[PDB]
Amino acid sequence: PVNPEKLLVITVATAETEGYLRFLRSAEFFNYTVRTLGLGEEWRGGDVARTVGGGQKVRWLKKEMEKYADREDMIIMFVDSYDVILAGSPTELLKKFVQSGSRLLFSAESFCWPEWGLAEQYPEVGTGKRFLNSGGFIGFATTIHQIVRQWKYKDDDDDQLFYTRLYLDPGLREKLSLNLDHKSRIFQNLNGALDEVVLKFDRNRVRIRNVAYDTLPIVVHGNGPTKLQLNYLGNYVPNGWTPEGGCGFCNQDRRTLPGGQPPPRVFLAVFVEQPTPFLPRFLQRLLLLDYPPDRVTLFLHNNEVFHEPHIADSWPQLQDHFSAVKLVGPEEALSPGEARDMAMDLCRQDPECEFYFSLDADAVLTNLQTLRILIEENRKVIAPMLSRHGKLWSNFWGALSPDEYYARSEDYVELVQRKRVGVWNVPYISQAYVIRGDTLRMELPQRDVFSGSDTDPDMAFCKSFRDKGIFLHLSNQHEFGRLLATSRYDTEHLHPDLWQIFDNPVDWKEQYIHENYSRALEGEGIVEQPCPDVYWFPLLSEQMCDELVAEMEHYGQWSGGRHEDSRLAGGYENVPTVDIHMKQVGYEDQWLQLLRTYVGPMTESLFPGYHTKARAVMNFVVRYRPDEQPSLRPHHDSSTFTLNVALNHKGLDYEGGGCRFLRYDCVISSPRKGWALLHPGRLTHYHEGLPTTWGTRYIMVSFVDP
Amino acid sequence: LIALLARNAAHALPTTLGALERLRHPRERTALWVATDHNMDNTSTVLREWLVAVKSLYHSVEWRPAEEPRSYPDEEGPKHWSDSRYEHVMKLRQAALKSARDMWADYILFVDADNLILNPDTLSLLIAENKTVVAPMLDSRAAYSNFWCGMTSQGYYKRTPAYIPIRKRDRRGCFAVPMVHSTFLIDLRKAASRNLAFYPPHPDYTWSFDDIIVFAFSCKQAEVQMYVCNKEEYGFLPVPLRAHSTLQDEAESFMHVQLEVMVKHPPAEPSRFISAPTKTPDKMGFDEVFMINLRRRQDRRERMLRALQAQEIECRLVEAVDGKAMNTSQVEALGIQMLPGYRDPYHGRPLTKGELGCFLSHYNIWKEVVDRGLQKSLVFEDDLRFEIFFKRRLMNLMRDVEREGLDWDLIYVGRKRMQVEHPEKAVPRVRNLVEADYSYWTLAYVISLQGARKLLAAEPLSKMLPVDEFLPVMFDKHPVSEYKAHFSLRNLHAFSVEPLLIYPTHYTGDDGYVSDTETSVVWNNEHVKTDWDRAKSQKMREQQALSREAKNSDVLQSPLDSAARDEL
């Protein structure tokens, strides 16, 4: 029945980093009594775990205990404050300490770090660990006073070898009842025991379990080269994310931009490279973000001459809009590492930019509130969660292989598809992030972060930011966007974006397909029926039509017109036209894909009971000119139904007429530029074309299910 | 509704049917959904006979015999589980689940044919935990069992830090697992159990296309943690065979499983409704099968006879003179004299009456072998642990030794390697054969006529000592040179086999360790009877101490001695 008021926690932290804050949250979750020592003092030691050190902690505690030199009744427990997160309530810890019954318990470790000679001097242990680790110890105030009063050495001296030499003496060990938790009942060190831990969930809290020994620890000390795995484990234990109550430390600690003051100055950036399709759309989207244009400072570093005309066309709207605008063209011959480095220097050396927010080329932020919510988060680093459409490729990683390369964690597939929500500790982020300017100023003073090695700049940047001890959050609370794919992008066309129908479907449909088409599909009117079994619905937008006619005139070769044919297998056309087929352009397969995906649902909704796989063999574009060829004679089509889509606007470019059905006395006189016609073409509908008068018209025709 | 899914399982059907019938539950509240497919053997008729015989007790029964065809088209062999076989198994399992759901039937135990529910309290104890899918711990002759401990990356078995602590019964109590094969009890009582699907894989499955993992993904993706408990012993199951084996190997494995069940438990009585296909005995290509037995102890003799019958090996049973009951009047008449200055090398006693009786029995057996002109013979004890495929492996080894041609006289079949050292030498052109060395516990030895003649020429009638000590001396490998100096000839050419074909039934200091050959009266007087050596066991087991850099890797391994799958 040990009272909880007699326990005091003593920890050391020269500075205040995110790890110390995490331990603070862990300690206050169970309502502990923690005392901090060496807060703000200069670290008179050196390398924390490279070779040796820790000789200032012992001097600090030697100064400290003098107030409790005779205080027997209470119980004191010492631990690191950078790489330790508590998991259990104080009652369990004190009950376990009472159960053990010794005067002093040390954390057991796998190896002998400081020296190897004294290994045989250790007393034998059956299954548990054998050696002693100075990571933490629990004991009476009198016992710790007696054991550590003898310290008289330099502040740069090591500590674990001192504790080992003290413990190895058998006489004092019997006298002071030194004991080691070999079976990991209280202390569990992750270094060397990485595979014997599994998270054991619960309703409102989490805990860890050692399947080797079937016990639940209270203190974990992820020392050694295991900082990453404890960073991972800190996401859940003990209040991170439970199945009942969502996540934990995610929604508090927000600025919420109060006061009505001008928003903090932001240094936007763009690093267009590996030429990305749909670039002009991205530039025009760079104007509609929800942020005052006087507080944004663009820096656009291009690296391809191919994109030069697009940026040239975009430029004067940008210069008219944001407070400051710059450019670094293809002629400067700068590597991406240099570009990112000089941008980081440019903001770092300007005391006015508080938040350097990078933004790579291919990251479409379909949500326009991203900057607001990110700045509202006030995390030391942060990055929005994005994903390739219809896959698992995201913009972050779960855990790192020993080669510092991509491994696969156990929650990655859960995080990508948004089965859990919060803010997640992550060992690598890319293609979007918001850095707090102070961390640039007095946490990252050195310039060379992206360059200086053979490694890629992003991985090197993360490696540099990791060892300095700054956490890299990732948030997925809302939908932020999606990553495009630039695995292959040919450019030997006037508009090479037209071939992107396979690679990036959503953006292709957004740009080319007529805007109204979805509403027509779901059935709220729009579709017109000027004559029975004849339908009028909008399919294509003006961009598609103008780019298509531009491509066709780029080809220019207006074959066809003679009654015979070489393209036709038979060699005898029913009626000839001045036409350009899609097989010669290389654009036939994409046309078939468009027919399959965007026509079939419409026709299956319009003519209920029909199922169509959308197979086509003949499809072309026809030009009508008053001098070359007139409109067609009455005829019939060798297919179930036909597609008739116009490509230029009547009146403004040509004057003429549409189609003419004999059996219904039907006349189409006003073909629309971006609409499609649907009518059966085998038996019932005898149609003829009206003749053009002035100008030039273009019509796209396809035969489906012949 | 204890259904099943069998294919060519007649090799062990009679015992499995009786074990299933031995369950202590209301027969008016039971059922069966048995079916067979792609069975090349006569398992269909055997199953139909029992189904007709027991058709009255079960509240209902069903069958869909599918004897045609007997094999898959794109099948590598009898043991090949291809994509078509896995798909058929998944479809059959899902059909069994669907039929189990249409009858408003609570709980279902889809136990396969290979498994054998030996204990009677399987369906009585298993359903008492109120679990979603509770599985029984089916033990076996090795590590492999029906309780995996974790999938690493793509359903492959990952040796967790608790599999060994679990299979050894160190901890008792239901512990969750990532997969549970064979004996599952998918209780249809709970509401959440309405989503489990077997045939149609879930759209969110990216692992392999095996049939033992599609159930795991459906179990996990529906939040039904398949617990598993090993509180009490349940039964035994056979280790899987290789992908190019034959049904005879499976039958041998089943027979070995039955023998292992009989090792410490009463024999598994087969079904009464169905018959028993008894086999004909033989001599395994040997000339004589010696068997030393004690008159007082008969349960061990009965077990050995039953094992020989199961092994289809005839035995030339022999008897031994009771050394403990023997007196000096008969002992001195035979001219049996103790060795000069000989005592126990571990305790200090000169000799024992049981040792004298064993030596006399061995001498009589050797004399009988010499008189009969027996070219080869096998001599064993009253307690041994036979290995799987022992008969075929022993016959192949003997045939290879005889065909190659060598002076094999003292080939070792069972020994305790007291010579803790590097690997012994390997004779040329010999498979799994090496030069023998100092060893104890020589209960089994395949001797030849030349070796027996040499032993008779040695004539150690005036020097009595343990046979295990005399044999190493006869092979010119005894550690102490005093015994060799006392001896006169060392012409015996001993040999050893790395794949030991026998082990002691009970180790020293274990359950049922009645050391009749050790605990006996002294050679002289009758008031010196050393009891069982508790502290100084010494010859406990020559396995833990040999778990070191013993090498023995250059010995040519036989095509046999290969089993287990991704699990061991």
């Binding site: 831990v197 998270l199 969930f201 491994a407 | 690493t152 709970k190």
Partner: peptide
């Protein structure tokens, strides 16, 4: 692939009786 989880779900309620 470090520190695998033991995602815990409670037992579902018993299903309704037949009629």
């Amino acid at each position: 692939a470090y520190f695998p989880e033991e995602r815990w779900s409670p037992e579902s309620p018993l299903q309704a009786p037949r009629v």
